[PDB]
Design a protein around this ligand. Structure first.
Ligand SMILES: C[C@H](N)[C@]12C[C@H]3C[C@H](C[C@H](C3)C1)C2
Ligand SMILES: [Cl-]
Ligand code: NA
Lengths: 25, 25, 25, 25
């Protein structure tokens, strides 16, 4: 378990990774 | 729950997203 | 403990640091 | 509580913020 704030920041970072990849594909 | 250091790093990443957006609006 | 999404985002950030270092050595 | 990996990534993120601030002061 995690603070919902920590989960959201985690989803930002993962989505940041996704898009970084997609912009470079 | 989360360690308070993880919460603070979370709040930094969220605020970082906020400001990144604001500077681009 | 942490939520696996938080763990995954963590591994991204650590791996990001590693790569940033390696690209600059 | 958090996974030590989450704590580690959190410290990276907080130290990244600090350095970012210091390089711009
Ligand atoms: C570096 C990210 N902003 C991150 C987001 C979440 C909070 C902390 C640790 C990890 C999960 C990674 C900071
Ligand atoms: Cl956590
Ligand atoms: Na936790």
């Amino acid at each position: 378990s995690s603070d919902p704030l920590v989960v959201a920041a985690s989803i930002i970072g993962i989505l940041h990774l996704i898009l970084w990849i997609l912009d470079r594909l």
